[PDB]
């Protein structure tokens with residue numbers, strides 16, 4: 001199947017939650033250029049936090 | 050002589066040399082900082098903002 005396996009109740013839990021431990025990585029990757037307007041986590045990450 | 054309200058070349062370059070896409074240092078309209086110019090189209094600004 002492949003090791004990316006949540007569950008369905010885990011999906012319902014994990015779709016209403018923006019900043020989980022994978023949303024943080026995929027939002028921190030998005031700081032090279034902004035590319036829509038801006039982000040808040042990029043302003044945090046470029047300030048040491 | 051050397052004192053008054055009629056100033057001669059005391060103001061800086063104020064060039065129209067916007068360097069897009071790169072990380073630079075800026076002071077436009079009073080606000081200092083280190084960032085990026087990046088061209089885009091948007092129209093919620095007014096002619097006094």
Ligand SMILES: *[C@@H]1O[C@H](CO)[C@@H](O)[C@H](O)[C@H]1NC(C)=O
Pocket residue numbers: 023026027030034035036
């Ligand atoms: C990252 O950026 C891309 C394009 O800029 C966008 O499609 C995507 O939704 C962004 N993801 C996050 C988590 O901000």
